[PDB]
Amino acid sequence: MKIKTIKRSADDYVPVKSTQESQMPRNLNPELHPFERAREYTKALNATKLERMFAKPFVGQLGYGHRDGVYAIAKNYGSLNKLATGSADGVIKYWNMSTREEFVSFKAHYGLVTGLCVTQPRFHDKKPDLKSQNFMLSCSDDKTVKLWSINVDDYSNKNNEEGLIRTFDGESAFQGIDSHRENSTFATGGAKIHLWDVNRLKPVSDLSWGADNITSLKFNQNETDILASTGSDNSIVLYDLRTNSPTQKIVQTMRTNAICWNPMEAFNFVTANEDHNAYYYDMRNLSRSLNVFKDHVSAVMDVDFSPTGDEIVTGSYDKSIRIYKTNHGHSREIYHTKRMQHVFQVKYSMDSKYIISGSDDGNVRLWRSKAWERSNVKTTREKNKLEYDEKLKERFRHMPEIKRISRHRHVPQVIKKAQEIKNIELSSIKRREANERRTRKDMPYISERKKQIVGTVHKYE
Amino acid sequence: KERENQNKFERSTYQTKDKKLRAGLKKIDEQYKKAVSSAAATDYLLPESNGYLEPENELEKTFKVQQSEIKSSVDVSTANKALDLSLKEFGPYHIKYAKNGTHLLITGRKGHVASMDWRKGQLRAELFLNETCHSATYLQNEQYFAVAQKKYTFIYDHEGTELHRLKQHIEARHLDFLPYHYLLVTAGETGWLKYHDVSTGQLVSELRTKAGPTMAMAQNPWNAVMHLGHSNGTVSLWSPSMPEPLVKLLSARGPVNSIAIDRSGYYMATTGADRSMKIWDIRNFKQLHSVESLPTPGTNVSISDTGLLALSRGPHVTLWKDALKLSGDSKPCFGSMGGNPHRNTPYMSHLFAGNKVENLGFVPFEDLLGVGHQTGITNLIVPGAGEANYDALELNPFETKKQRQEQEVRTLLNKLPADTITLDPNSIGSVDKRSSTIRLNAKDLAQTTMDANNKAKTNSDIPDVKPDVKGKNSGLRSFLRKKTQNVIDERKLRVQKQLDKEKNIRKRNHQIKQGLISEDHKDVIEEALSRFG
Amino acid sequence: SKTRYYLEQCIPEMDDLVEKGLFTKNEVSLIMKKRTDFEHRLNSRGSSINDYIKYINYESNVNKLRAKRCKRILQVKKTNSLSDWSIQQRIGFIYQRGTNKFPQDLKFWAMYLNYMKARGNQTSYKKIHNIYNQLLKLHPTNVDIW
Amino acid sequence: VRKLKHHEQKLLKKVDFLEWKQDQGHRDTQVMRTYHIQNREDYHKYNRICGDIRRLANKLSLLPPTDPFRRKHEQLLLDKLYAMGVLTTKSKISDLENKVTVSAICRRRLPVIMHRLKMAETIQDAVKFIEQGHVRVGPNLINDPAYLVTRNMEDYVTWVDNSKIKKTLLRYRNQIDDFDFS
Amino acid sequence: QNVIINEKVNKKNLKYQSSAVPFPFENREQYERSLRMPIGQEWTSRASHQELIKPRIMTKPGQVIDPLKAPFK
RNA sequence: UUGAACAGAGAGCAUUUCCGGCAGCAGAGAUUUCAGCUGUU
């Protein structure tokens, strides 16, 4: 006969010291954790309700803003605090974003400014300090491109020359500007694409596919010798400046307002296009738009890729800013306020969270890329909670209640009505094309990723 | 990475040329099986062992020992939890332990209600209600507890402060609680079931059992469903959404006397006043095996959390081991003919002298079962009752007050809505039943719309013509008679014409069968005047 | 939590150990009971160097036991299996957490340094360098440690 | 149970473990407290009588105005209630509809009548006295504390003779007259 | 005979259940294969719990991010 | 932008080196352990 029941040790469970924290035992058994699916579901619902609780993206503005309305913004690729806003009255401003204030304000020209770039001039003469002064390239309207110096108080290794390192003249009004960042070659866009280098006051070379005015251009961030430039006859053109030969051209259906590359893939690019849409192209086969972002109401104005290679920010001529993932093709987030009208530029900051946004009003408002991730650093347990909830939500995505809650957002009134009007139009168009496919013999299925291309100049097999 | 626990650990369930999907599936299979094996590795960390009583002789049995020898033989802590009250003044007593195993709630039949810690002997609340109090339970903590009454059901505070007269639970007779939905379930002597949310204080639903007075009630925890035993001989499983019963079962003749359910959600024990007992497989609904001749109607039976069965039939109390296994040897039996080992002897017996067991319940996380009878309370020591090694995220049997209020707020924020209670606990995750098995697309939906708009030409709706099968069971004629006589439709014109066609072809086949003009007899006059029709 | 993670990492060596013949299941579970008590008292607040020392002494004892046990029970002085240096680097990791939660006590520092000098077969010359760097940057005004 | 913080409150708006929608302000308890009565069943039975009176007044309203049936019956009911003691002013049949309260009936009860006539000192003490058996209604005494009393017995409620209460009273006035052994 | 199942459809469960097989899958068998394992701490071990909760994109928080440079070397 | 060496950190990559299994020798710590020597697997 062996008799032994359960013995419990109080010193095994409730410990000795009056400070030592209480011990926690476990047992992972499905006979002792009953409602697995329902518990995870209600946890997901609580998660998305808390996200709507903390949905507060807007975080502030810049100093007093300009006097006319922002038409260009450039982010310092070297630092994180620094940007430059080109207004429309004719004043450029260099901004510190640590305390949200103006460094400096220059009356650059008399007409508008057209474009900015912030950079590091590799003079053959001497190397300017890349910790003491940062150097802007400002392209005007009155036939001027100037290189400017700014004293930045990042460091204090030390403790003159407040403006106008040099000027550059031309014939036409330039429209766009940027810099091939190796040995500081820079492209300007006016009548024809003129490639300049710093010390020579003259264009090193010139290209143009046709005789059209050219309005915007951009070098790719990696494989850094390739130029992409749009064209007012609804065109995209590619150039390989190591060859100085214009590489390829395609003609679209509407003028492409802006363009940018993704710095995580380096041979794809997004084109913000006037028919209310955004397009995603690869560098090899321009025949297929790799994707189409399709959630606006009027002219888009600008896009930018993400440093994380996943987010695309766009700002419409409508009073709104949209944000998309690279995958889904319908806008995840939408920001807006009554205090801003016709956003003209939006850019990412170099740490994948903060969005600079220059609208037409003259303020510059910045936003969070996630409505939930408070910038504050967080303890371990809380970090685990937030991540566990996010993966749980991403799992339980397509249940209908979670779908309704997370998709439910607020948009302004005129825009809601205009979306429903466009929806009514699309339903009628569906009916008409269905009747046409009934009646005629063979009309080929023309996919939505190619319903917007009229033709390339170089073709394939 | 094969182990012995995978059989219990594994969560049961029901190929493309797409590379991303293939990689996703191989990824999820790899990490799923790694996780299951890791939990089977967490198996080692459990602190204690089960309790066991083993004979070591064949001359000695198991049941012949009693509480005297066991109290002498096992430790001072267990012998001190071997409670023995004496409440001779008020009527027979009924018992409910709280879920934490730490607060005893007793109710006499006359007015006595007491709520005690019982372990370090604190006494929270005592109330001498005069009206006949019928049943009682803690609801969510040791802070809120409900008793029934003669007529109206009352909710009392921890101290004895009266808090609620829940009007609409008329003549309540058996209470219980669902702790993961804050649900008070009351079975009345009205035949009505009433589910009440104690959180917002709102009756979630009623349910109408057309049998009669609710005889007995118990809940399946792993499904959170309510089991009622009526008077007709039926036991019926219900859920608070639909007004029809989920399932009915004819388990006893005469009236049902008691129901009880194992925590594993896979075994039910019912006992009926026709001196009978049934051991039921819940899922698939096959009454597994049945004892037919007990020498008393069983009052109350209850399940262990380790697989003991407790039977209470008047002045006796018996406990059986390993009873719920399926094989035809584990039949519970009062005696083994000539030491027949395949039969199942009683595991531990006891009598009471002059009482009658009013009911009984296991303690949660010790190994004792508490008996409530006509004048006193007793807590019998049993070796293998409770799982010694608990889990501390749901039920912490050692609970500081701060930890209490934290667990309580967390469960309020973590409640389930009352509508997710069904017969299968993965259905809230799974797909719709009616919708398609394979995911179709825009092209597929355009195709099926085109097919349903071509069906008017290709006759897709009405069953087609075969002269082979007999005209009684002929699908066209059964369709025609299933349709009424008074309205005539274009579909009906179509089915009339094709039934004429089936008659024609079947009569030609009858002529070729019986032996009239056959072997490709061609009617070329019909050929020649088909020109204009 | 953190206790759970450390025990989880502690499993597979014990798994291999009872998988080989030299340990049985009850010995295993008792050892893990002692381990839980130590690691939980280490990760609550209120612990100290005396707690650390008691844990390290316990693990050194179980290493001696496993040595004599395997030696007797299968005559293999050193088996090609995870267990050995697993126990050893568990000890070294305990030393590491000990200095990080208390960098103050030179006695405990010295026990760590003497253990690392003693097991000089499998040390890293670079790891003794790392320890001396740690000690000098924390105490530079200890000419004796110099 | 926590004074739980901001976000968890705005998630758990509608929860309340103390006051529910159905126990409407704990009205029964509050009136029970003000008049020191003993059973929840007493309150709810008074509720039922009040409810039946109000359904009578409602159907009497739904009858057409100038019926002598209606006039004579409503006036007779007003006689019955004014002699009963529940409602005060006999003229407003609106106050038949709107003044009839369980508070009014429970104040027509016995111990409130003691506090009315300033027999006892406060109402709980009056309940102690009626339970202890010192107070009689006319020729016999009362032990059931929940006696209803109309006006015509409010006229005759008094303390019992040769009680130590009446002894103390007439002793303070210096008028105990122990031939009656009062 | 002596078993009677209800066939009616619980409409609130019909709300709580899915729509169809959603786009990123192909078959409801796949859909249940994904929704097989609960991810909670109270169902798997802590190591696998972190291993399943480690998200795809991760950054260090307060540092300048750089476009990737080709390592041809 | 390259060519050499100089001084290395140890925070990367491959062992394709040999060792972490033994009989005999002596040195060392307070009985027991760290490295070499010869042959061996």
Short mmCIF file of all heavy atoms in Angstrom, two decimals, chain A residues 194-240, unseen atoms left out:
data_model
loop_
_atom_site.label_atom_id
_atom_site.label_comp_id
_atom_site.label_asym_id
_atom_site.label_seq_id
_atom_site.Cartn_x
_atom_site.Cartn_y
_atom_site.Cartn_z
N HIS A 194 19.91 69.91 -69.53
CA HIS A 194 21.29 70.36 -69.54
C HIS A 194 22.05 69.79 -68.35
O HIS A 194 21.66 69.99 -67.19
CB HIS A 194 21.35 71.87 -69.51
N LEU A 195 23.12 69.07 -68.64
CA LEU A 195 23.95 68.47 -67.61
C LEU A 195 25.14 69.38 -67.36
O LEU A 195 25.94 69.62 -68.28
CB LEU A 195 24.43 67.08 -68.01
N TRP A 196 25.26 69.85 -66.13
CA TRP A 196 26.30 70.79 -65.75
C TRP A 196 27.17 70.14 -64.69
O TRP A 196 26.75 69.22 -63.99
CB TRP A 196 25.74 72.07 -65.14
N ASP A 197 28.39 70.65 -64.58
CA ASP A 197 29.24 70.36 -63.44
C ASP A 197 29.58 71.69 -62.78
O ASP A 197 29.35 72.75 -63.35
CB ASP A 197 30.50 69.60 -63.85
N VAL A 198 30.14 71.62 -61.57
CA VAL A 198 30.15 72.78 -60.70
C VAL A 198 31.08 73.88 -61.19
O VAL A 198 30.63 75.01 -61.38
CB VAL A 198 30.49 72.35 -59.26
N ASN A 199 32.36 73.58 -61.41
CA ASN A 199 33.31 74.66 -61.64
C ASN A 199 33.12 75.31 -62.99
O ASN A 199 33.23 76.54 -63.10
CB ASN A 199 34.74 74.14 -61.51
N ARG A 200 32.79 74.54 -64.01
CA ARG A 200 32.48 75.11 -65.31
C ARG A 200 31.12 75.78 -65.21
O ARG A 200 30.14 75.15 -64.80
CB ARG A 200 32.46 74.02 -66.38
N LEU A 201 31.07 77.06 -65.59
CA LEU A 201 29.78 77.76 -65.61
C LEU A 201 28.91 77.34 -66.78
O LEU A 201 27.78 77.81 -66.88
CB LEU A 201 29.97 79.27 -65.67
N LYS A 202 29.40 76.48 -67.64
CA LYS A 202 28.68 76.13 -68.83
C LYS A 202 28.16 74.71 -68.72
O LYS A 202 28.70 73.91 -67.95
CB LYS A 202 29.59 76.26 -70.05
N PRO A 203 27.09 74.38 -69.43
CA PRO A 203 26.62 73.00 -69.45
C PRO A 203 27.65 72.06 -70.04
O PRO A 203 28.18 72.32 -71.12
CB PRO A 203 25.38 73.07 -70.34
N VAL A 204 27.96 70.99 -69.31
CA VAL A 204 28.90 70.00 -69.82
C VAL A 204 28.32 69.30 -71.04
O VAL A 204 29.02 69.06 -72.02
CB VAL A 204 29.26 68.99 -68.72
N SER A 205 27.03 68.99 -71.00
CA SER A 205 26.41 68.42 -72.18
C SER A 205 24.93 68.74 -72.20
O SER A 205 24.39 69.30 -71.25
CB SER A 205 26.60 66.90 -72.25
N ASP A 206 24.28 68.37 -73.30
CA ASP A 206 22.85 68.55 -73.41
C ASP A 206 22.21 67.38 -74.15
O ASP A 206 22.75 66.85 -75.11
CB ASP A 206 22.52 69.85 -74.13
N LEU A 207 21.03 67.01 -73.68
CA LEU A 207 20.23 65.96 -74.31
C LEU A 207 18.79 66.43 -74.38
O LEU A 207 18.38 67.37 -73.69
CB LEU A 207 20.30 64.64 -73.54
N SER A 208 18.03 65.77 -75.26
CA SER A 208 16.58 65.87 -75.35
C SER A 208 16.12 64.81 -76.33
O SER A 208 16.72 64.65 -77.40
CB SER A 208 16.12 67.25 -75.83
N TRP A 209 15.06 64.09 -75.98
CA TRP A 209 14.54 63.10 -76.92
C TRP A 209 13.81 63.78 -78.06
O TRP A 209 13.96 63.40 -79.22
CB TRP A 209 13.62 62.12 -76.21
N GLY A 210 12.99 64.77 -77.74
CA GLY A 210 12.33 65.61 -78.72
C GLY A 210 12.56 67.07 -78.37
O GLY A 210 13.39 67.40 -77.53
N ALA A 211 11.82 67.94 -79.03
CA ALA A 211 11.86 69.37 -78.71
C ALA A 211 10.66 69.76 -77.86
O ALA A 211 9.79 70.52 -78.28
CB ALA A 211 11.93 70.19 -80.00
N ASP A 212 10.61 69.23 -76.64
CA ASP A 212 9.53 69.50 -75.71
C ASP A 212 10.11 70.10 -74.45
O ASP A 212 11.26 69.81 -74.09
CB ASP A 212 8.76 68.22 -75.39
N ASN A 213 9.34 70.95 -73.78
CA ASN A 213 9.72 71.40 -72.45
C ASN A 213 9.67 70.24 -71.48
O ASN A 213 8.80 69.37 -71.58
CB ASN A 213 8.79 72.51 -71.98
N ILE A 214 10.60 70.21 -70.55
CA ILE A 214 10.72 69.11 -69.60
C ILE A 214 10.60 69.67 -68.20
O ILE A 214 11.28 70.63 -67.84
CB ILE A 214 12.04 68.35 -69.79
N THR A 215 9.71 69.07 -67.40
CA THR A 215 9.24 69.68 -66.17
C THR A 215 9.76 69.04 -64.90
O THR A 215 9.78 69.70 -63.86
CB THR A 215 7.72 69.67 -66.12
N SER A 216 10.14 67.76 -64.92
CA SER A 216 10.66 67.14 -63.71
C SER A 216 11.62 66.01 -64.01
O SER A 216 11.52 65.35 -65.05
CB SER A 216 9.53 66.61 -62.83
N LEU A 217 12.56 65.78 -63.10
CA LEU A 217 13.58 64.76 -63.30
C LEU A 217 14.14 64.31 -61.96
O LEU A 217 14.01 65.00 -60.94
CB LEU A 217 14.67 65.30 -64.21
N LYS A 218 14.77 63.14 -61.97
CA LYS A 218 15.31 62.55 -60.76
C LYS A 218 16.33 61.47 -61.08
O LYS A 218 16.11 60.64 -61.96
CB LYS A 218 14.19 61.97 -59.92
N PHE A 219 17.45 61.49 -60.37
CA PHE A 219 18.38 60.39 -60.42
C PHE A 219 17.93 59.30 -59.46
O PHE A 219 17.38 59.58 -58.40
CB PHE A 219 19.77 60.83 -60.02
N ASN A 220 18.21 58.06 -59.83
CA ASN A 220 17.92 56.94 -58.94
C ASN A 220 18.93 56.93 -57.80
O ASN A 220 20.09 57.30 -57.96
CB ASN A 220 17.95 55.61 -59.69
N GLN A 221 18.46 56.49 -56.64
CA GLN A 221 19.29 56.53 -55.44
C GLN A 221 20.39 55.48 -55.49
O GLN A 221 21.46 55.66 -54.90
CB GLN A 221 18.42 56.35 -54.20
N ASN A 222 20.14 54.36 -56.15
CA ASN A 222 21.17 53.36 -56.33
C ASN A 222 21.21 52.94 -57.79
O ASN A 222 20.24 53.15 -58.53
CB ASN A 222 20.93 52.17 -55.43
N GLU A 223 22.33 52.32 -58.19
CA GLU A 223 22.79 52.35 -59.57
C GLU A 223 22.77 53.80 -60.04
O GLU A 223 21.98 54.23 -60.88
CB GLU A 223 21.98 51.37 -60.45
N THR A 224 23.64 54.58 -59.41
CA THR A 224 23.40 56.01 -59.27
C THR A 224 23.80 56.80 -60.53
O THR A 224 24.05 58.00 -60.44
CB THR A 224 24.12 56.48 -58.01
N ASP A 225 23.88 56.16 -61.68
CA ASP A 225 24.13 56.92 -62.89
C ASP A 225 23.00 56.84 -63.90
O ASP A 225 23.27 56.72 -65.09
CB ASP A 225 25.42 56.43 -63.55
N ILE A 226 21.74 56.89 -63.47
CA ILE A 226 20.61 56.78 -64.37
C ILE A 226 19.63 57.90 -64.07
O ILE A 226 19.27 58.12 -62.91
CB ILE A 226 19.95 55.40 -64.27
N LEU A 227 19.21 58.61 -65.11
CA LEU A 227 18.31 59.74 -64.98
C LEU A 227 16.93 59.36 -65.51
O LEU A 227 16.81 58.73 -66.56
CB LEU A 227 18.84 60.94 -65.75
N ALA A 228 15.90 59.78 -64.79
CA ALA A 228 14.53 59.62 -65.26
C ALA A 228 13.89 60.98 -65.32
O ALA A 228 13.88 61.72 -64.33
CB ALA A 228 13.72 58.72 -64.34
N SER A 229 13.34 61.32 -66.47
CA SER A 229 12.78 62.65 -66.61
C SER A 229 11.46 62.55 -67.33
O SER A 229 11.33 61.82 -68.31
CB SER A 229 13.71 63.59 -67.38
N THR A 230 10.49 63.29 -66.84
CA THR A 230 9.18 63.27 -67.47
C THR A 230 9.16 64.27 -68.61
O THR A 230 10.15 64.92 -68.92
CB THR A 230 8.11 63.56 -66.43
N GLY A 231 8.01 64.38 -69.26
CA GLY A 231 7.88 65.28 -70.38
C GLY A 231 6.45 65.68 -70.63
O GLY A 231 5.56 64.83 -70.66
N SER A 232 6.23 66.98 -70.86
CA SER A 232 4.89 67.55 -70.93
C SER A 232 4.04 67.01 -72.07
O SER A 232 2.84 67.30 -72.11
CB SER A 232 4.99 69.07 -71.06
N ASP A 233 4.61 66.26 -73.01
CA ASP A 233 3.77 65.52 -73.95
C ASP A 233 3.50 64.12 -73.44
O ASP A 233 3.61 63.14 -74.17
CB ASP A 233 4.42 65.48 -75.32
N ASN A 234 3.09 64.05 -72.17
CA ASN A 234 2.72 62.82 -71.47
C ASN A 234 3.76 61.73 -71.62
O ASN A 234 3.44 60.62 -72.05
CB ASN A 234 1.36 62.34 -71.95
N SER A 235 5.01 62.03 -71.29
CA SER A 235 6.09 61.11 -71.60
C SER A 235 6.96 60.83 -70.39
O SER A 235 7.13 61.67 -69.51
CB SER A 235 6.97 61.65 -72.72
N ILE A 236 7.54 59.64 -70.40
CA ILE A 236 8.62 59.26 -69.50
C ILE A 236 9.83 58.96 -70.36
O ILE A 236 9.69 58.32 -71.41
CB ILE A 236 8.25 58.04 -68.64
N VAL A 237 10.99 59.46 -69.97
CA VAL A 237 12.22 59.24 -70.72
C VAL A 237 13.28 58.79 -69.72
O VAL A 237 13.33 59.29 -68.59
CB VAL A 237 12.68 60.49 -71.48
N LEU A 238 14.11 57.84 -70.14
CA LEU A 238 15.23 57.35 -69.36
C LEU A 238 16.53 57.70 -70.06
O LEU A 238 16.60 57.67 -71.30
CB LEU A 238 15.15 55.84 -69.18
N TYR A 239 17.55 58.00 -69.26
CA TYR A 239 18.88 58.36 -69.71
C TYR A 239 19.92 57.60 -68.90
O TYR A 239 19.76 57.42 -67.69
CB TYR A 239 19.14 59.85 -69.55
N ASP A 240 21.00 57.21 -69.55
CA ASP A 240 22.12 56.57 -68.88
C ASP A 240 23.34 57.46 -69.03
O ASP A 240 24.08 57.37 -70.01
CB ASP A 240 22.38 55.19 -69.44
#
